[PDB]
Amino acid sequence: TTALVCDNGSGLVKAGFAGDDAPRAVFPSIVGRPRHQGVMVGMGQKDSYVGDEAQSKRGILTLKYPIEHGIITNWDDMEKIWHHTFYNELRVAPEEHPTLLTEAPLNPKANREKMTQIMFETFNVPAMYVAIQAVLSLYASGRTTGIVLDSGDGVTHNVPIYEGYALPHAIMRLDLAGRDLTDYLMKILTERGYSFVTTAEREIVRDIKEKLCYVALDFENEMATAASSSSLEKSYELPDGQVITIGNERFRCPETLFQPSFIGMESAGIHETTYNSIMKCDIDIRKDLYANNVMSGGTTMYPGIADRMQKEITALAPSTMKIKIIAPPERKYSVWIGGSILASLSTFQQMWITKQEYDEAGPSIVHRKCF
Amino acid sequence: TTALVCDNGSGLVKAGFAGDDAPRAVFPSIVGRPRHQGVMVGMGQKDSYVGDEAQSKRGILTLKYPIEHGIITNWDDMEKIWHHTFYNELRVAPEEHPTLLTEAPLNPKANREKMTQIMFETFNVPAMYVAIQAVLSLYASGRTTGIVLDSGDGVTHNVPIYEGYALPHAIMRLDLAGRDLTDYLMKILTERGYSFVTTAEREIVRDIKEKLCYVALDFENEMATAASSSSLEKSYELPDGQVITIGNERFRCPETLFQPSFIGMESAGIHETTYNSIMKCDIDIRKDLYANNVMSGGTTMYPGIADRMQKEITALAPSTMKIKIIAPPERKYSVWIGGSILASLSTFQQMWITKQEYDEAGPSIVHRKCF
Amino acid sequence: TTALVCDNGSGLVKAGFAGDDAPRAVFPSIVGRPRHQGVMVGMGQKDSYVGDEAQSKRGILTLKYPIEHGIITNWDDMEKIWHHTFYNELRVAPEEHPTLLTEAPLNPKANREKMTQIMFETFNVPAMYVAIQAVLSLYASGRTTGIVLDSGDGVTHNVPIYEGYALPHAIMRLDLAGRDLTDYLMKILTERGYSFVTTAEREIVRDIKEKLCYVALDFENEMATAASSSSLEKSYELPDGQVITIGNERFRCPETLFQPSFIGMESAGIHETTYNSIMKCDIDIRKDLYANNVMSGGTTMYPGIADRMQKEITALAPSTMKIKIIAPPERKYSVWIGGSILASLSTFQQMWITKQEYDEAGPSIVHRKCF
Ligand SMILES: Nc1ncnc2c1ncn2[C@@H]1O[C@H](COP(=O)(O)OP(=O)(O)O)[C@@H](O)[C@H]1O
Ligand SMILES: Nc1ncnc2c1ncn2[C@@H]1O[C@H](COP(=O)(O)OP(=O)(O)O)[C@@H](O)[C@H]1O
Ligand SMILES: Nc1ncnc2c1ncn2[C@@H]1O[C@H](COP(=O)(O)OP(=O)(O)O)[C@@H](O)[C@H]1O
């Protein structure tokens, strides 16, 4: 039968059926709970909203993401997320549909262990599997080599791969992503008079970040331009009107990606860790990687980030190589398409984890060679 | 069985049975007492009049409202009011009908405590409840969101509500209502040479305020008109003839609702407190409220107050949000109709306060979440 | 010559000369304007009262604080505040006296820029500087590490500092302070029959909040005590007699500091934000902070807030660390003493901003490395 693919992720869960060309269901991976008393009794005020319902009801809710940085901290909210997914978005019973789940590399083992435990016991899936998001993003691009830089909402990582073989000893993971960038935007939108403190308006700052922010090709010259001229200011109307104006922030914010020291982290930027992960690899297979830099995730949607990344990585790397960057136009959902392709394959039929073998060997089956 | 819905309020008590479409009884919430000696014995002259008979006998009585500003200051007179209500207007025994009671928010807890105690012990009701007048007014309007502005005789308040959840921290109460407007009208009718000092004549000024007063859509141009022309003066016959004529007053009086500085108050006007109450709520629910202003109470009956309220609240609000004001034609009794609706519901049946549980826990039951 | 130290703040402005041991001038940072017409001509009624004369004339004024939450919204009134300060409290000319200005962190740049512009142009100072209130409070305490929790009238913040270096990314700001607590006290003093609505009566409620309120070391047991016993009620005579009595409120009010959800705010309490700010700093330097949790500001004057703070923060923190809380008896003016010390130093001489530099580089000099 048809296999299911579920990309839990942070910020946005995206689920659908294998073999398709786009994910059928996408909605925010948030959970809401009311925070006022309620006086008009009988209106069916459910004690928990999920996904887009909470997104629409925010004004009376307190939003709580259940996956912080690739790791799950609340398993009740995550169970509710999965149940709402299956029974409202896909409207399919998991009784006969094997699912494909994803996680960031170097994650705690308990996360995937309990994920499989729950998927087998509570939802009773006939089979399942757990892949690494970067390999899925690569399979989506129809290659077999190339360093990949998946950067979503919680985590950022590099997985250098060659001919289908991934080098785990050079995986570099950075815990700076779109969420820390939204936090920095909320930090620096206060030097213009505006304030955002509620978790219902962190979503608003997130929308502003998506709409108006871009990347500076030369951060110093662009900062000087913002200082002298004023062409960069762009307006934005909050959901009650009172249009705001932001200037320097539009590129001051995602510059944190290239200099994490802005928000108090000691680590290096995106391009530096990329070049490092390359230099950790064998001296024979670095040119293929320089040629096949693959970008994915939602945070790599920034206008012009490709040119900036290329300039920085050419500044760092030698000058006699050819530095390419694969930034497809639909890169955001590349992980889901890669998962769908990996599922719809014919060689994959012995990679699943059947419920028989799960009951026979427990939740430690994923760390076993049946990955 | 059928439940009673008693909306005490100031100025006019309105009682009746649940499930109906209008209150069965409405009469002035006054208590009269004779103030002369009487010489024709054998009449059986009562020792205290109440309600409509007091209104009819004013010329020999001294009228005394027992609820001043949402709070009850005389409990003997309010006991008499409730007794006369039940045994003469509705002619029903409270021994077999649970009743519903209302009050303005931010009232002293003693008021509702003693209301509950008296309704339980003295009248021996089988059950009861105490609702907030604004939420009942919203019930009658057939919504589940929308800031409401109830304006009765002694109290005026705003309760912003969203999906049945009301925000208690953005409630704004004002102690300027129809009674202070009657006092102002009595004050300014003394420049036209007319005098009113008695409590039997405050009723006359009240009838004048109801029949002739209106709201100035543009106060400055309307004052200029009242200076230049004379087209506005509408006559009025006092109960002994001697027709009076009033000019500027017809709109000079209810402007106090928009500028309390006329009578020495420091708080803002109706529209500014509404806008403030809106600005205290979350930034994501403001547009629904702007769209769903609800009005109630008798003081929102002034001809033209809706257009004036809309103009002011638009001048204060942003220029992109659409501002509505839901002023039904029967808005005056929205509180009672909403109370009847709340009573005749099916989920409301376990929300009462039983005499058993009351005798078990005392009058402090209402402060308990059994509200 | 001697350097001037001016601490604007909300609630109380405190100015004086460097090197002293107490501020020479403290008066309420209010501005009062008359609100009645006046009939006795020739009495020389000025057109705007300022400071303590406004406090003494309140009964005929409308008070208007010009600094709401660390930010200034009326610059005319603040200009008048500074003028009155220099020419009546200190009676000194700013023509040769460099001054020291303070502000809460994460403030809009416009407030500071215009403060600098006005101090240079209008008052014509020879030099000036703008420091952060928390670092001043720290310098007053003779340390160089330890996080500080300054909590005045309009703003509350945390600044983790280590060996003179302050971590900017772990600063936590909260917009809940003494003013919101006075608002809550005015909110809950209405469930006892008393009403306070005028802006001249907010001062009275403020004095009540200062004299009678305290913190409950165990809120639930204290609420139970207030329910059962009555030993807690303390009387208070309003300026015309009619002594009031308050019970539960005495500790119900400053509990908002530990649960902002009481007044509709979503952020966490004092102790939670403190612990978060600690968990945001490096792992190797948390013990010094736990050991040196400095307090300051006027809102930390509440009787017993230290024991409650320590109990809560130990409940949140690990159990093997020593959790001290430095709370000097004179912390209320620690910011001004710290400013006086900073000025009285010998290394601070090249940190000012001379009028030459300002006329050469404009008001944007404060954002420049000459801070
Ligand atoms: N056009 C855009 N510009 C900038 N940021 C974006 C854009 N689109 C999405 N994002 C960011 O990407 C994040 C979503 O991450 P996502 O790719 O869903 O993670 P995952 O792939 O692990 O589910 C959001 O938090 C959002 O801030
Ligand atoms: N058509 C009208 N025009 C002006 N004022 C009115 C009108 N109808 C009622 N009022 C005023 O409304 C008041 C009655 O308030 P009401 O709505 O009965 O308060 P509650 O509902 O709390 O009892 C009266 O004092 C009267 O002055
Ligand atoms: N003993 C006290 N008890 C309770 N509150 C106090 C006490 N002393 C001062 N306050 C509060 O502190 C506030 C003054 O804050 P302050 O420290 O002057 O701020 P700033 O230093 O920024 O001017 C006042 O509003 C008052 O309510």
Side-chain angles (χ1 to χ4, degrees):
Chain A
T1 80
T2 174
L4 210 57
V5 53
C6 296
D7 193 55
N8 44 359
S10 172
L12 274 175
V13 56
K14 40 195 82 68
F17 290 95
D20 296 334
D21 48 322
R24 154 166 279 115
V26 164
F27 59 96
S29 189
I30 68 172
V31 162
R33 287 194 165 78
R35 77 177 178 110
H36 292 92
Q37 50 260 44
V39 182
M40 298 177 69
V41 57
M43 290 326 105
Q45 311 94 7
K46 49 178 89 79
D47 64 326
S48 159
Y49 300 88
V50 193
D52 197 2
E53 215 68 23
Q55 182 64 234
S56 276
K57 303 307 214 76
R58 286 167 328 165
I60 56 158
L61 298 182
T62 175
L63 314 184
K64 281 279 169 53
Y65 291 67
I67 317 179
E68 289 269 348
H69 298 104
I71 75 170
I72 309 174
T73 40
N74 208 5
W75 281 99
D76 311 309
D77 292 347
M78 197 65 202
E79 194 268 359
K80 277 173 199 163
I81 281 288
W82 275 315
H83 171 82
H84 168 265
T85 288
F86 286 174
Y87 291 69
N88 287 145
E89 294 294 329
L90 294 176
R91 282 156 282 103
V92 63
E95 305 290 345
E96 79 278 37
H97 278 67
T99 66
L100 182 65
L101 312 181
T102 71
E103 72 160 359
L106 314 187
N107 258 325
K109 282 71 54 182
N111 186 47
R112 46 163 43 183
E113 282 176 358
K114 196 166 182 65
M115 181 147 42
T116 68
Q117 169 192 1
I118 283 185
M119 211 61 48
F120 276 113
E121 290 175 19
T122 290
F123 284 101
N124 183 25
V125 288
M128 72 155 301
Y129 189 94
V130 173
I132 313 99
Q133 287 164 346
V135 164
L136 290 189
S137 68
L138 186 56
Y139 278 175
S141 178
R143 327 286 179 73
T144 58
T145 69
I147 172 169
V148 59
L149 190 146
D150 192 283
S151 162
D153 195 328
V155 300
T156 309
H157 50 275
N158 301 324
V159 174
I161 296 169
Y162 200 86
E163 300 299 81
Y165 296 92
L167 307 200
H169 70 95
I171 300 182
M172 294 190 89
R173 164 170 168 152
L174 194 64
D175 51 356
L176 157 73
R179 199 88 69 83
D180 267 329
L181 283 171
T182 314
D183 287 340
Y184 189 40
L185 194 51
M186 293 176 78
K187 215 187 88 189
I188 59 181
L189 276 188
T190 59
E191 61 209 5
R192 291 247 178 181
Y194 321 100
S195 69
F196 300 87
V197 296
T198 308
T199 62
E201 42 195 1
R202 180 187 315 280
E203 304 275 322
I204 299 197
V205 178
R206 204 194 41 84
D207 200 59
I208 298 189
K209 193 200 70 167
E210 282 192 7
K211 272 184 184 58
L212 311 191
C213 290
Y214 71 100
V215 191
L217 260 285
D218 178 298
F219 174 72
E220 269 311 318
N221 275 125
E222 190 69 27
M223 180 64 66
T225 295
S228 64
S229 68
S230 159
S231 62
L232 316 172
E233 297 176 17
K234 278 210 70 176
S235 69
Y236 186 112
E237 169 206 328
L238 298 176
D240 63 352
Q242 46 163 313
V243 52
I244 74 168
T245 192
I246 82 176
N248 209 2
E249 286 86 26
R250 301 180 56 198
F251 71 94
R252 196 182 180 192
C253 163
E255 170 69 5
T256 303
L257 275 172
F258 300 102
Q259 284 155 16
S261 88
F262 278 163
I263 67 181
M265 306 165 75
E266 297 282 331
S267 315
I270 292 315
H271 63 288
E272 181 70 31
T273 71
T274 315
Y275 177 57
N276 278 344
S277 177
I278 300 287
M279 293 292 287
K280 293 186 190 171
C281 282
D282 293 331
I283 203 176
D284 281 29
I285 59 170
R286 295 183 193 170
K287 59 187 188 43
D288 307 67
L289 309 190
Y290 284 127
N292 317 307
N293 219 318
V294 170
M295 305 190 89
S296 67
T299 301
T300 57
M301 208 56 60
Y302 273 90
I305 199 181
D307 301 12
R308 165 64 167 281
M309 184 80 171
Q310 181 170 354
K311 184 170 66 67
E312 306 280 15
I313 196 184
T314 54
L316 294 187
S319 87
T320 186
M321 300 304 173
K322 307 301 178 177
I323 323 292
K324 190 192 192 157
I325 284 174
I326 305 297
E330 56 95 26
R331 72 186 71 94
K332 164 184 269 200
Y333 318 98
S334 66
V335 60
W336 188 94
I337 307 186
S340 72
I341 290 172
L342 182 64
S344 68
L345 277 181
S346 312
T347 57
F348 203 77
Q349 320 310 320
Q350 60 260 7
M351 317 301 290
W352 297 103
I353 295 175
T354 183
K355 187 160 169 49
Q356 185 266 7
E357 184 181 9
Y358 165 73
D359 305 333
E360 185 166 340
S364 158
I365 192 65
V366 291
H367 309 323
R368 291 285 173 261
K369 195 36 60 186
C370 187
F371 194 76
Chain B
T1 66
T2 184
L4 287 177
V5 176
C6 170
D7 183 58
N8 45 311
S10 44
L12 278 167
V13 54
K14 39 197 83 69
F17 293 98
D20 308 345
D21 58 356
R24 168 158 271 119
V26 161
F27 54 93
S29 200
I30 68 187
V31 171
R33 284 186 166 78
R35 75 172 170 109
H36 294 90
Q37 66 276 25
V39 182
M40 292 179 79
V41 59
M43 190 151 293
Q45 304 109 357
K46 292 305 294 174
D47 71 314
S48 68
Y49 292 94
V50 58
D52 201 6
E53 286 82 5
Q55 184 79 223
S56 279
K57 304 302 212 71
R58 296 178 300 169
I60 48 160
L61 307 192
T62 174
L63 312 180
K64 279 271 166 56
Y65 290 72
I67 317 181
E68 285 265 357
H69 296 114
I71 77 176
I72 307 173
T73 41
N74 204 10
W75 280 100
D76 305 332
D77 290 344
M78 200 39 182
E79 199 275 343
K80 274 172 199 156
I81 283 281
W82 281 323
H83 163 89
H84 165 270
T85 290
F86 289 163
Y87 292 108
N88 303 135
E89 286 296 319
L90 306 192
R91 69 184 66 85
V92 302
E95 311 278 5
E96 68 279 10
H97 298 117
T99 78
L100 176 72
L101 305 184
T102 73
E103 71 178 4
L106 306 193
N107 280 320
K109 297 215 290 285
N111 178 44
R112 62 166 51 206
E113 275 173 14
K114 199 158 197 54
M115 189 147 50
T116 284
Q117 156 196 357
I118 281 182
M119 212 57 50
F120 271 129
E121 281 313 293
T122 287
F123 282 81
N124 187 31
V125 300
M128 54 147 291
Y129 185 88
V130 170
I132 302 93
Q133 290 170 334
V135 164
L136 296 186
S137 80
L138 204 73
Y139 276 151
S141 177
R143 324 286 167 73
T144 58
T145 67
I147 180 170
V148 55
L149 184 139
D150 191 281
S151 179
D153 193 325
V155 69
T156 308
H157 59 268
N158 293 267
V159 171
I161 303 161
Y162 197 81
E163 307 290 80
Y165 296 91
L167 317 189
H169 60 100
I171 306 179
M172 298 193 92
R173 173 169 163 156
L174 206 65
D175 263 348
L176 173 69
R179 198 93 61 87
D180 284 287
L181 299 192
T182 313
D183 285 337
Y184 194 35
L185 186 50
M186 290 179 78
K187 207 182 92 195
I188 58 179
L189 269 175
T190 67
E191 65 188 2
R192 291 253 167 188
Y194 312 106
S195 67
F196 303 83
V197 295
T198 41
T199 59
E201 270 180 48
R202 186 192 320 278
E203 300 278 331
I204 296 172
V205 193
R206 206 195 39 82
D207 201 66
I208 296 189
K209 190 199 74 166
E210 282 201 5
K211 277 193 179 55
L212 309 189
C213 271
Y214 71 98
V215 161
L217 198 59
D218 197 316
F219 175 68
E220 269 314 311
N221 283 115
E222 202 87 37
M223 190 59 72
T225 290
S228 317
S229 79
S230 75
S231 83
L232 320 169
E233 303 174 10
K234 281 200 68 174
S235 82
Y236 184 112
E237 180 181 359
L238 300 176
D240 73 312
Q242 47 173 308
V243 60
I244 84 166
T245 197
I246 66 170
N248 210 10
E249 288 90 14
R250 310 179 52 198
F251 70 96
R252 194 185 174 197
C253 181
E255 172 79 351
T256 310
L257 288 182
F258 300 103
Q259 291 164 49
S261 309
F262 286 165
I263 69 183
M265 292 173 63
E266 280 205 36
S267 297
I270 292 317
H271 64 272
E272 187 176 359
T273 65
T274 295
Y275 177 60
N276 273 349
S277 176
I278 297 294
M279 294 301 276
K280 293 188 193 173
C281 312
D282 289 76
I283 180 173
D284 297 12
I285 49 169
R286 294 182 181 172
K287 69 207 171 39
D288 288 330
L289 310 190
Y290 281 127
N292 312 300
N293 285 110
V294 176
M295 303 199 102
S296 67
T299 295
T300 56
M301 211 59 51
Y302 279 73
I305 201 170
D307 294 28
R308 164 64 168 279
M309 184 73 181
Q310 170 170 351
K311 185 174 75 66
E312 307 275 25
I313 198 179
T314 44
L316 283 189
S319 84
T320 176
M321 306 278 117
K322 187 197 140 65
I323 317 298
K324 285 174 65 68
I325 286 167
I326 305 297
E330 54 96 25
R331 79 182 74 92
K332 163 183 272 202
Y333 315 106
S334 304
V335 55
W336 188 92
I337 302 188
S340 82
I341 281 176
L342 176 62
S344 69
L345 270 183
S346 314
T347 78
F348 184 60
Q349 313 297 332
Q350 68 252 6
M351 303 273 291
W352 300 95
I353 290 172
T354 61
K355 187 169 158 69
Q356 186 262 17
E357 176 175 12
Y358 156 75
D359 300 328
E360 195 181 345
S364 168
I365 186 64
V366 293
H367 308 337
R368 184 174 292 118
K369 184 63 179 176
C370 205
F371 199 67
Chain C
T1 67
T2 187
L4 209 50
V5 175
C6 166
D7 189 58
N8 44 0
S10 178
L12 281 168
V13 56
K14 41 195 88 72
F17 289 90
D20 308 344
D21 53 357
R24 291 157 45 85
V26 171
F27 60 93
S29 185
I30 68 173
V31 172
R33 288 185 170 84
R35 75 172 172 109
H36 294 92
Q37 61 267 41
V39 184
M40 268 180 148
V41 296
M43 191 58 69
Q45 318 100 357
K46 46 177 85 76
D47 71 308
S48 68
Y49 296 88
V50 179
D52 207 278
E53 275 72 7
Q55 181 78 228
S56 296
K57 303 304 212 77
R58 288 168 334 171
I60 45 172
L61 305 190
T62 171
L63 311 185
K64 278 273 167 54
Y65 291 71
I67 318 182
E68 289 263 1
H69 300 106
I71 80 174
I72 310 175
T73 40
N74 205 10
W75 280 100
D76 304 333
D77 292 343
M78 200 42 189
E79 192 276 335
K80 280 179 198 159
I81 284 288
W82 279 317
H83 165 86
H84 167 269
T85 285
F86 288 170
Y87 290 85
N88 301 137
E89 295 271 291
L90 294 189
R91 283 146 291 103
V92 303
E95 306 287 354
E96 75 275 22
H97 278 71
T99 78
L100 182 65
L101 271 298
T102 70
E103 75 162 3
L106 310 188
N107 271 321
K109 306 159 60 188
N111 172 45
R112 157 183 310 201
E113 281 171 12
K114 198 154 189 59
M115 176 151 45
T116 289
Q117 167 197 1
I118 281 185
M119 208 61 47
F120 273 122
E121 279 168 26
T122 291
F123 287 90
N124 185 28
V125 290
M128 55 146 286
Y129 185 90
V130 167
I132 301 93
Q133 290 170 337
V135 160
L136 292 187
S137 88
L138 201 72
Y139 280 172
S141 177
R143 329 290 172 75
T144 43
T145 75
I147 76 165
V148 51
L149 186 134
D150 192 281
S151 160
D153 188 302
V155 68
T156 302
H157 55 270
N158 293 80
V159 188
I161 298 170
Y162 199 87
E163 300 295 77
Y165 300 93
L167 310 196
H169 59 103
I171 303 178
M172 304 291 262
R173 178 163 165 152
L174 202 62
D175 49 356
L176 166 68
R179 196 92 62 86
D180 308 62
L181 296 193
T182 313
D183 284 342
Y184 192 36
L185 192 48
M186 293 172 78
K187 209 155 82 61
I188 58 179
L189 272 184
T190 43
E191 67 211 9
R192 292 241 175 192
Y194 319 108
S195 68
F196 301 84
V197 296
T198 40
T199 180
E201 264 181 49
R202 176 181 319 277
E203 303 272 325
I204 295 194
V205 178
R206 200 194 43 82
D207 187 33
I208 299 193
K209 192 202 70 169
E210 282 199 2
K211 275 191 184 58
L212 309 192
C213 289
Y214 72 100
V215 191
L217 198 151
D218 196 310
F219 174 70
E220 267 311 320
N221 291 113
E222 275 270 27
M223 184 60 70
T225 293
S228 64
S229 69
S230 158
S231 82
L232 314 173
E233 303 173 12
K234 278 210 69 175
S235 90
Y236 184 87
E237 173 206 315
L238 273 64
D240 73 306
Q242 45 182 346
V243 59
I244 82 165
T245 188
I246 66 170
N248 223 359
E249 287 91 11
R250 301 183 54 200
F251 70 96
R252 195 181 175 193
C253 182
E255 169 76 356
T256 310
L257 280 177
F258 301 102
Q259 298 167 45
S261 81
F262 278 156
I263 67 178
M265 299 174 66
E266 178 149 338
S267 296
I270 299 307
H271 60 287
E272 210 72 33
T273 66
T274 287
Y275 177 61
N276 277 346
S277 177
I278 302 290
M279 298 300 280
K280 282 181 180 176
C281 318
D282 294 331
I283 171 163
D284 280 30
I285 58 162
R286 290 179 188 171
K287 58 186 176 60
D288 287 330
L289 311 186
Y290 282 126
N292 322 303
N293 194 350
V294 176
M295 305 193 94
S296 67
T299 298
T300 56
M301 210 59 49
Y302 276 75
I305 201 170
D307 291 333
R308 164 66 166 276
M309 185 71 175
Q310 169 177 351
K311 163 180 157 287
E312 306 276 19
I313 195 184
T314 54
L316 295 181
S319 64
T320 179
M321 304 297 182
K322 312 298 170 182
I323 320 297
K324 271 175 47 193
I325 290 176
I326 305 297
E330 56 95 26
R331 52 192 165 257
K332 168 181 259 209
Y333 318 101
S334 67
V335 58
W336 188 93
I337 304 189
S340 67
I341 290 172
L342 178 64
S344 177
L345 277 182
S346 312
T347 79
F348 192 61
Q349 321 305 323
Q350 64 256 6
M351 311 288 284
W352 301 96
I353 295 173
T354 183
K355 192 163 163 55
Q356 192 266 10
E357 283 192 26
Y358 163 73
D359 305 331
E360 187 165 338
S364 177
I365 190 56
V366 280
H367 311 329
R368 302 294 178 89
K369 281 318 303 162
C370 187
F371 193 74

